[PDB]
Design a protein around this ligand. Structure first.
Ligand SMILES: CC(=O)Nc1nnc(OC2CCN(c3nnc(NC(C)=O)s3)CC2)s1
Ligand SMILES: CC(=O)Nc1nnc(OC2CCN(c3nnc(NC(C)=O)s3)CC2)s1
Lengths: 410, 409, 410, 409
């Protein structure tokens, strides 16, 4: 027997040779993107034989064997329905409906405190999915760059725990939510910030990453890291947003000094310098698509799903998801944890980084925020998604009532 | 082909006939207990034929099929290792290691606030498991009855949400935790108690269950409900514990009166009676074993695993596990949710009712409490369990480092 | 020489005999009331000679000497303008103006949570003055009985420290105000109520007065005490108010149980009985006139000014004035101390018991309360009073700008 | 008859001529200092006459009248015991006892966070009095200059209310104390600092004084203002303290940035400059003697008692005495108001500027502080002072038990 050969008969349909487009659309219908890095050898060989023989465009058992041999393990799982969402075409149909249902929630106010997010239109709205297996789907304004802002706080924490361990990082920052009107305090009772998703704890976590090196190499260190998470999709940097964040951050300058007085930073910290590195990290740019790969990396126990690369330790990813559950959505965290039950993180540009552990990661984006600071459409989408699918943290995988389960088939 | 016949050769091992004891030990090793209610029919036919011919005790293809046809699907799943933990024999060996490792933590102080918990010895310690499929195992003092106390709070919240729905119950109680030094407040800013796991909200939740009937019928209704949840295993009641909570509950009278003044109960409430009903509910008795079935009922989306009965709506169970995750372990809730990541609920008699969703439910019991109020051995066990198995809520099921996974082979 | 003889020529106005009405009007104009207990002998002797010599009504040097001998010291000080307010006639004209200026502030809501405080008309308004010397003046509805309610807290605190001393009493109750959003807390951080003017602390103090005896003698012990303080003017008791306060006091029962749990009472306290005794003390009745004598006794270092009787130790009065200054007007305490600067206490019936140390006591009464719980007209009257006179605690007795000083003349 | 003549016989004692020393000693025993500014003409004429007739040194009815006519009303009041404390010689004997009783309380820790307050000896200790009439007395280290630090907060609040009025100033700062552990907060619920005695509110008040002018002239205005208040006694500036206060005042920058974000300042303020101006004001230097005259100006309705000039409006003095009563001694404020009953203000150098309204002002100084931040010897002295004299705010001026009253004979 032979794996390349048995896969050949599945797509051959008893016939003699497979047209290339018939193989291409069969492969794309699994949700894989024809530009998947795990598929580069297969696609390079296909492009070559489509030159070598204008005499086509048909592959026999032996010619198909030449192309798919290099990536046969991933292609077989994709064609024999072994992916975490087996019927991806029906699932994306559902994502499209949920998107259109949220597209009608036109309330909210765009963050206006800086001219660079006031520039963004309230009609933008996109959602990108990326499963723990690499299946992609987008709808809407998903290639528009926008800043992570507070969406970057869980990614920084993951990098800090990945490099320093849990016990070290949690000398300097706590692990609990604060309480629905302890939002205005910087420190909990141990004179540590309450947790990494809070501004005071985000700043302290920022002062742990790559100490001893200067602000240019730290920024390089974190961006190289964010590239691995996104399978080398778009990660950028807005100097416009950063220069404004620098000139309008009196609240954070207040935090920095209060943290200096109470000896919250590591010894030898340049507090004002850490504030620049902090403002920088909030001005990193993503699209919906590139961020949906980041979120899926946390969804996937730390391995980027479109490269197979190990990016974060299981200890760093578990801690980040734990803190996104309960501290992730500003004052909505408690209500969100109850009704949605997913690790999520919101931002002022309109991002919501959403992780369905063991299934997929997502990024929703609509600039207009409601009064607690979360994208109006994004929050609507997240409620709708969990009403439809048994992805809630404490839904049952066996007795889930009237919800659909995309991890099953019939 | 034939499903009863194929199982016969599976356990017969090509041989002539199955001894009766060889079938029972084969069955017990799947984790099923020979008294499972879903197996009563099979066990009745065995009880009949073990009289029919003392010239035995051997079952032919036809005689084995005589007993097992009634329960063949459940027996096939158990023998083709389709149960949520396929190698149950090995997993219980690990539970024994974790139990013995916690048995050496003799620190802590027994709750003495009532003479009925001061009389319980610091040497007691039991652990019971019940998987979403019915596989059972116990170690230690697992049949000694004890009161739930605050372990009962998630169970009554489930009943209330099961009968009245989420929107109603949460007109009267919040959904968030309060904050690590907001423990001393009764109400949040919307004038509802913070959540059903704290005393002020447990008191309010109690005033919602089965309104319009008197306190004796209310209590009977909750006992009937707690019976369905434990697959009819041990549920009792201590009149002694009830009398001491009654005569020493000035704090609960303080809460009750504060809630009456700020109009937190549903209209037509006899506040003083509801405290009596509340004190009663805290004095319900369980054993480790019976409660581990209750926990598995939450683990199993609302269906009791040793009877298959639908006991709670999926909405009541999802809400209860949500609120146990973040509010279940007193001031330890935050540290606990981070490190263990399992919905749990603790009590002052020393209980910790523990849920691993889609896998199993658990009950630990050791009377000596730490300074935050949680059983010392019980907390030690929960850390060790999650350190060993990828049961943490935000462990990944595919890339889980050097932890063991009891769901695979 | 002779005091009876020189006071004789003071009123004689060079003629030979004094009409009786001419002496009485001279006496009333000092503000003394012709029924002052320190004047009983003089008034009895005057009424007697108006029977024995109907051939009058005129008194010579020797007949004047017959009547005023007994109370000549009090009469001389009154006639030689030696009283704390020498020109009482002019001062009462001002009290009348201040009264009329507040009669025009008809806002507020009468307290309605029990039927007997809702029954009071919103148009009642009275104010009574009583100096440390006994000079009286009233305007408005000054003889209508009403309940003290929270006005009783400074009087029972004074009774407790008069019998037990400060250090004993302040084992069970603090001495500071709480902070404008520590209002809902019962205990401070030492597990004592914050101070005697708050409900939780008034209840605890009630549990220190006259321990070991039952509720009837306790009530008698306190009423006799209030009688001495008011120079035997009207002190009464509403059983109606007590019955409604009792069956509608769920927060006070809430306080009682919380205080039992945290062991705030003395050993052997019958907590529910102390709540009965507390409700009773809140339903004791006064009129404006009778309550204004109470206030002056605190103004007067503990000596009731119309009987000369020592009623409270100087330690008890100093402490009670200290706490009325900072805790007496509910959430208005800080604003009141700042702008009025007088020891004062308010109640839900509409009373404000007011003390100007070393000068006078006062009681204002108008049932309509403002949104913090204080009589609207009463608070208005207090601001007006101190804008007019240098009575504010930290006004200067020498350089007081354009304010009037009733303690001086020209 | 004649005012200069009757005064002459008062001190002449029927004799022929008054020696010069006999008059100077008579004058000092009234407590006036032979250098009072209100006595300059009289002392100039004495210094003028002490040269012409070295064949003296004794004054006739006419030569005494030569000098004293210019200041006759002040001298007569002092000699017919019309001063607020008629028997000053006996009163200072009592302050000497109180000083000596506190000198035996050697506990406390000198402020260490800057090298300029660690340099001061733990055994320095001074007390100075100055009455509303100008009678002076000191015991101890009363001419050693030290920084006001937070003692300057009431003086600048007074300047601000004196120049702009109460309604304007209290748009930017509240008027209550905060709550015994609401100390860690900067703003109340109205987004104003709680009151001027607090760091967050002193910072805001600093931003209202003389707006629109630069930091050098602003500082000159405040020094000119402090000079009128101390009757031109010693006021200085420590540049060392100012350099260390700015280079270690991270909490103050935290306050400034938080106050800037919540728009607490008036329009057009350079927040970073106002922190410099604030640090400067905290480094103003005084001695015990000079600062107690400042206190006497507050005691005296705004008129400096040793020059007679009006320095502050009565509205400003009342408000500052109001806020010093309740906020002046950090976490000790409530306790202090209850037990001492005097408006006072403390500072980290160890000063306590204390006001007994309508009688006298005071300044105590001993560097070793409490754990709440107040001078130990200074706090002890204030308690002792009020146990002795009926100066407590709510003492009775008529029925005051066994306490002494320095205002009577
Ligand atoms: C606006 C209002 O009404 N109140 C206020 N809210 N926030 C304010 O800003 C500061 C609060 C004080 N600081 C603290 N952080 N954590 C603390 N707890 C401990 C145990 O250290 S204290 C820094 C921020 S003031
Ligand atoms: C720790 C300390 O110093 N004092 C105290 N600690 N606990 C106390 O119990 C009482 C607190 C006051 N009441 C309230 N409950 N919830 C509330 N929430 C809101 C938003 O109003 S207010 C009744 C219980 S007092």
């Amino acid at each position: 027997p032979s794996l390349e050969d048995l896969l050949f008969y599945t797509i051959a349909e008893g016939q003699e040779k497979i047209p290339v487009h018939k193989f291409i659309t069969a492969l794309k219908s699994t949700g894989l993107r024809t530009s998947d890095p795990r598929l580069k050898e297969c696609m390079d060989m296909l492009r070559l034989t489509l030159q070598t023989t204008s005499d086509g465009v048909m592959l026999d058992k032996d010619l198909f064997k030449k192309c798919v041999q290099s990536n046969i393990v991933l292609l077989t799982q994709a064609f024999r329905r072994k992916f975490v969402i087996p019927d991806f075409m029906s699932f994306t149909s559902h994502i499209d409906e949920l998107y259109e249902s949220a597209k009608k929630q036109s309330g909210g106010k765009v963050a206006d405190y800086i001219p660079q997010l006031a520039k963004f239109s309230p009609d933008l709205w996109g959602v990108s999915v990326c499963t723990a297996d690499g299946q992609r789907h987008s709808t809407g304004d998903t290639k528009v760059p926008f800043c992570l802002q507070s969406c970057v706080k869980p990614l920084k924490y993951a990098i800090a725990v990945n490099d320093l361990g849990t016990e070290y990082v949690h000398r300097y920052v706590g692990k609990e939510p604060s309480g629905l009107r302890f939002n205005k305090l910087f420190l909990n009772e141990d004179d540590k910030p309450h947790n990494p998703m809070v501004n005071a704890g985000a700043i302290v976590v920022t002062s742990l990453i790559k100490q001893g090196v200067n602000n240019a190499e730290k920024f390089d260190y974190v961006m190289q890291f964010l590239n691995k998470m996104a399978g080398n999709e778009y990660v950028g940097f807005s100097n416009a947003t950063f220069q404004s964040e620098r000139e309008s951050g009196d609240r954070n300058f207040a935090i920095g000094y209060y943290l200096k007085e109470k000896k919250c930073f590591p010894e030898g910290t340049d507090m004002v310098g850490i504030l620049d590195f902090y403002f920088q990290l909030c001005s990193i740019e993503v699209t919906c698509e590139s961020a949906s790969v980041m979120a899926a990396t946390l969804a996937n126990g730390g391995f980027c799903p479109i490269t197979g690369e190990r990016v974060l330790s299981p200890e760093a990813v578990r801690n980040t998801l734990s803190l996104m559950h309960s501290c992730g959505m500003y004052d909505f965290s408690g209500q969100f944890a109850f009704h949605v039950g997913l690790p999520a993180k919101s931002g002022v540009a309109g991002g919501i980084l959403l992780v369905v552990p063991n299934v997929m990661g997502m990024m929703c984006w609509s600039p207009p925020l409601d009064k607690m600071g979360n994208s109006v459409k994004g929050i609507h989408f997240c409620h709708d998604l969990v009403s439809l699918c048994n992805f809630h943290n404490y839904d049952n995988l066996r007795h889930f009532a009237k919800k659909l389960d995309p991890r099953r088939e019939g």
